[PDB]
Design a protein. Structure first.
Ligand SMILES: *[C@@H]1O[C@H](CO)[C@@H](O)[C@H](O)[C@H]1NC(C)=O
Lengths: 213, 94, 213
């Protein structure tokens, strides 16, 4: 099966630099042209750069020419994007995409990696319980973090049905906030344990909060 | 406008490689886009050899573009042409 | 540059109907160099159609493409709820560009929201700020009004809303409204009320609590 796995995004200062990579498997990599495509938050798709399977033909979008360099190492099944002189408008999810044999098209895509360009510092969130009052609803308030993203699971992933994790909202303070809620039978309240697992990788915060009445 | 006649040929096979040439002939006026494409993506200027747009002697023009490819990958390479609003794509003959 | 535009911007249709999506190119693009992509909310795009009319690997027959020159069409016959996505056209007649995308939403029967209110936790209260959360769970259509009243005083400018993407399974939405007050302002009032108006409710629904319970 064709698989492409991006890595290397994160928070970077304006004017800074960052190196993205894409690991390919399931096909002869040296026989396919490769691309980078990006998607700014809540925005459309924007093609970034193209490199042919022997690196002979290379193209860049005008918005990155002079600042980004695409390259590949066929012996390591690897695609790279070197990003220099980064700007705020470079903030996006960056996708690795394979170019189809003969007839073209971005026929396989990676999972994406997020690049955030800002001169604001990393801050881990506080995690507060949203307590069932007296089917029931309970949850967790993940407040005051930067940058995106935060991930939330319940009971280490064992509780999946009825979960809503809302998109983060930007506060006037410039920090992000998010709540995650789940509905459960009011019968379960006496027997079952509910723990929300919040992970904010950029700030090295893992928190497990048990939610009870 | 006279629509160009397009002919694609293979030549100079050597060292596992081959030259594919795309010839546009007897067209008018002189302005024409001619480029090799690889999986449908146009090659850059540096990977191709370019003939001048020259008069026939019959009142029309002719030109050519060539590029060097690995023998076996011919099916991935096509000649692309734009002339006064019309476009066409031609394969490497097999 | 070739610019692609797409119409309509949004398309709301019931399951089993036929969706007709339009793509327009600022100049002629040969049919071989026009492709279509589908992107579901949390995912990477996937190739749907290449060469204007050819289905990519594993694409069902209800997806079809046609067109030439400057006008292209994507047809999704017999819509399904999981077909909720943004659809992008893309050309590589010259460079690589995407259209802005068309969002396709699934229409469904009116469903009223289940409303819950959550008081600020005692932990968050250590910290001098108080967040009151109101949950609107599983409703349709998305239009909804949420109003905060403290001591029956309507609040303005101090709440933020967040809405889930339309659920792929049941096409419902969920929404959160978060009221933010200082610990000072919170402990000077007693009744905290969330009032929601929706098409599925014959009359507005109010959830409330008293500070201390
Ligand atoms: C053959 O052609 C390929 C592709 O153009 C080129 O990269 C390579 O250098 C050539 N090899 C030889 C031995 O000439």
């Amino acid at each position: 099966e064709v698989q492409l796995v991006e890595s290397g995004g994160g928070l970077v200062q304006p004017g800074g630099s960052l190196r993205l990579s894409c690991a390919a498997s399931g096909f002869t990599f040296s026989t396919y042209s490769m691309n980078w495509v990006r998607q700014a938050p809540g925005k459309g798709l924007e093609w970034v750069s193209y490199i042919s399977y022997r690196s002979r033909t290379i193209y860049y979008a005008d918005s990155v020419k002079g600042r980004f360099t695409i390259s590949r190492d066929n012996a390591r099944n690897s695609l790279y994007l070197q990003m220099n002189s980064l700007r705020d408008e470079d903030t996006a999810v960056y996708y690795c995409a394979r170019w189809g044999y003969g007839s073209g098209g971005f026929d396989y895509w990676g999972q994406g990696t997020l690049v955030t360009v800002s001169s604001a510092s990393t801050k881990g969130p506080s995690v507060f319980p949203l307590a069932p009052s007296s089917t029931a609803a309970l949850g967790c308030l993940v407040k005051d973090y930067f940058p995106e993203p935060v991930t939330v699971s319940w009971n280490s992933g064992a509780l999946t049905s009825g979960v809503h994790t809302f998109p983060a909202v930007l506060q006037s303070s410039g920090l992000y906030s998010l709540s995650s809620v789940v509905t459960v039978p009011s019968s379960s309240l006496g027997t079952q344990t509910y723990i929300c697992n919040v992970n904010h990788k950029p700030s090295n915060t893992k928190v497990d909060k048990r939610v009870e009445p | 406008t006279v629509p160009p006649m397009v002919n694609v040929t293979r030549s100079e096979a050597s060292e596992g490689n081959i030259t594919v040439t795309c010839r546009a002939s007897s067209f008018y006026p002189r302005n024409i886009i001619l480029t090799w494409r690889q999986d449908g993506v146009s090659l850059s200027h540096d990977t191709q050899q370019w003939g001048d747009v020259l008069p026939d002697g019959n009142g029309t023009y002719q030109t050519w573009v060539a590029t060097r490819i690995c023998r076996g990958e011919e099916q991935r390479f096509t000649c692309y042409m734009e002339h006064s609003g019309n476009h066409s794509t031609h394969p490497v003959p097999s | 540059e070739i610019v692609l535009t797409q119409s309509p911007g949004t398309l709301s249709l019931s399951p089993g109907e036929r969706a007709t999506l339009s793509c327009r190119a600022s100049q002629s693009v040969s049919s071989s160099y026009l492709a279509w992509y589908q992107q579901k909310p949390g995912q990477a795009p996937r190739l749907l159609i290449y060469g204007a009319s050819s289905r990519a690997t594993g694409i069902p027959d209800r997806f079809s493409g046609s067109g030439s020159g400057t006008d292209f069409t994507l047809t999704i016959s017999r819509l399904e709820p999981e077909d909720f996505a943004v659809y992008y056209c893309q050309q590589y007649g010259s460079s690589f560009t995407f259209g802005p995308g068309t969002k396709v939403d699934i229409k469904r029967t009116v469903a009223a929201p289940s409303v819950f209110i959550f008081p600020p936790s005692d932990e968050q209260l250590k910290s001098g700020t108080a967040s009151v959360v109101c949950l609107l769970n599983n409703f349709y259509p998305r239009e909804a009004k949420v109003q905060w009243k403290v001591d029956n005083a309507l609040q303005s400018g101090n709440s933020q809303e967040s809405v889930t993407e339309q659920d792929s399974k049941d096409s419902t939405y969920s929404l959160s409204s978060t009221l933010t007050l200082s610990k000072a302002d919170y402990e000077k009032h007693k009744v905290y009320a969330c009032e929601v108006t929706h098409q599925g409710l014959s009359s507005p629904v109010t959830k409330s609590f008293n500070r201390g319970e």
